[PDB]
Design a protein around this nucleic acid. Structure first.
Length: 131
DNA sequence: TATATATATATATATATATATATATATATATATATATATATATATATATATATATATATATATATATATATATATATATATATA
């Protein structure tokens, strides 16, 4: 396929596919039931490592989300299968980015030293089983 | 007229039992809307290429599979016309 496509062609696709995309979402519910426990695995392995750190290092209520933004982006980079040779660069990239959004670096050096215990989350939960 | 037995009305308060309204905040249970981002689950659109899966069009030839037309004759299969 190309790239360069007009504004009308994409709108024409999205408008005419409405019936098929909703009758495909109706089957994607059946598929989502068994695959949805990656949510449970994700928040288990993130809260089990961040609730003691945030809770005992002294950060407040509503800044915990900004720290979750940092940790969640790091876990996304992890479970797209990317090991330490890219992580040693994306750690200082994320450090500068969330310093730029108003955090304090006396928290950030300790937090970037802390996030090496977060790992990959998502697995597969549908086996083939031809029998 | 005064009592004992039950059905409802009032007179004026304070109680115990349940149905809903408010007064003003705080909380536990669920349905949705927002504020602002970063995630995990799926439906489609794009940005830009290279892949694997199938539907068709072309580029240029060569080949295996069948449907018909010709080129030039010779022959096996049947339908009819002539020659004598």
């Amino acid at each position: 396929r190309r790239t360069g496509i007009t504004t009308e062609d994409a709108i024409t696709k999205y408008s005419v596919k409405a019936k098929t995309e909703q009758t495909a979402y109706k089957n994607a519910t059946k598929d989502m039931v068994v695959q949805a426990q990656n949510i449970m695995n994700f928040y288990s392995v993130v809260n089990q490592a961040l609730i003691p750190w945030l809770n005992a290092h002294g950060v407040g209520g509503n800044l915990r989300i900004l720290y979750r933004q940092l940790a969640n982006e790091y876990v996304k980079v992890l479970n797209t299968k990317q090991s330490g040779e890219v992580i040693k660069r994306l750690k200082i990239a994320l450090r500068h980015k969330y310093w730029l959004r108003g955090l304090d670096e006396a928290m950030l050096d300790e937090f970037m030293d802390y996030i090496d215990s977060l790992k990959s989350t998502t697995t597969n939960y549908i086996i083939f089983n031809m029998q």
